[PDB]
Amino acid sequence: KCVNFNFNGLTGTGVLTESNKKFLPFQQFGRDIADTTDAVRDPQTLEILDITPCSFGGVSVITPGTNTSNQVAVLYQDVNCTEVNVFQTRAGCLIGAEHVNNSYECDIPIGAGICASYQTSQSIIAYTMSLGAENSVAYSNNSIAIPTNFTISVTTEILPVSMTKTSVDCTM
């Protein structure tokens, strides 16, 4: 259970657990690569405890535009919903969105194949994103599709070239 602790003046916060780490009789503490204490021998009962982080993760608020709705959904990144409508993703615990079996194109991306959209009384749905419509190309060893007609597109592409010529007298 997540607790504050103090062993002999070593303070910290974490989920203490029983551990398999075989300390030798002279050792009192074990350390992470970060120099933070990773395990301890309790000073009244000489068992070895892991010390592990109280769970954390970024609070990614999914929202349609305020020029549309004030309804919102929260991806708590990485965490399991047991620690926090509610849904679980490989990206984290997702709250206030509604999971949907149908696969739409990605609106707001959430991660690990999940995307969200505002849809039908409406709600924020979250779904496994469509990678576009699935299509059997009608291949056969003697079949060809030849276009009988065209469209002259005017696809428009919009490249940066300069950027605004700032300068700063660092003295000033």
Binding site: A138, T148, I152, S153, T156, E157, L159, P160, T164, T166
Partner: protein, 203 residues
């Protein structure tokens, strides 16, 4: 305009952050430099001012470093743009999906604030028909092949046609070249091929 407008936004946000950082006190007693100087004699003021210098200089080094990396992005985009100017405006790009989706035709540059816009005119094919097709076509033992384009049939009759637009041309030694004989060609089809010369000599 999301690209150019985001470049403007990014630069303005970088400046606005650099500007806000003048107000951040970096552990000095105040962030108004003239306030420190009007509060304190140099024995004291120099420590406070040196914290502000260290902070502001570090913030400036940060901003300039961000601007150098961003200038490298912008310059890579400018070289990309200059290449679309050179290959698509001044020329035609043979390079698939470089100048717009579809086969490229031409581009018209339109200036835009701190960027360029290209109107990439592109041919895109859009109404298919399915056809029976063959790699090559036997005439009398000789395997004929299309010079440009493809062989196809509606069902009862074989035609050569361009790759990129259906145009059934009757098959003739004008549009076909011979190679070897039938046997080596997996999937060859019979037909006949027109002799475009003999009916003139006959007439």
């Amino acid at each position: 305009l999301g690209k150019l407008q985001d470049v403007v936004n990014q630069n303005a946000q970088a400046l606005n952050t650099l500007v806000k950082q003048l107000s951040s006190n970096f552990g000095a007693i105040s962030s108004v430099l003239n306030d420190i100087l009007s509060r304190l004699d140099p024995p004291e003021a120099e420590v406070q001012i040196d914290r502000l210098i260290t902070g502001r200089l570090q913030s400036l080094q940060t901003y300039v470093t961000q601007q150098l990396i961003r200038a490298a992005e912008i310059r890579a985009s400018a070289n990309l743009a200059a290449t679309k100017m050179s290959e698509c405006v001044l020329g035609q790009s043979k390079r698939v999906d470089f100048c717009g989706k579809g086969y490229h035709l031409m581009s018209f540059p339109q200036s835009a604030p701190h960027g360029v816009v290209f109107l990439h005119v592109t041919y895109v094919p859009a109404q298919e028909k399915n056809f029976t097709t063959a790699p090559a076509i036997c005439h009398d033992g000789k395997a004929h092949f299309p010079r440009e384009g493809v062989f196809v049939s509606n069902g009862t009759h074989w035609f050569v046609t361009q790759r990129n637009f259906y145009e059934p041309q009757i098959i003739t030694t004008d549009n076909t070249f011979v190679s070897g004989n039938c046997d080596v060609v997996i999937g060859i089809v019979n037909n006949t091929v027109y002799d475009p010369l003999q009916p003139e000599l006959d007439s």
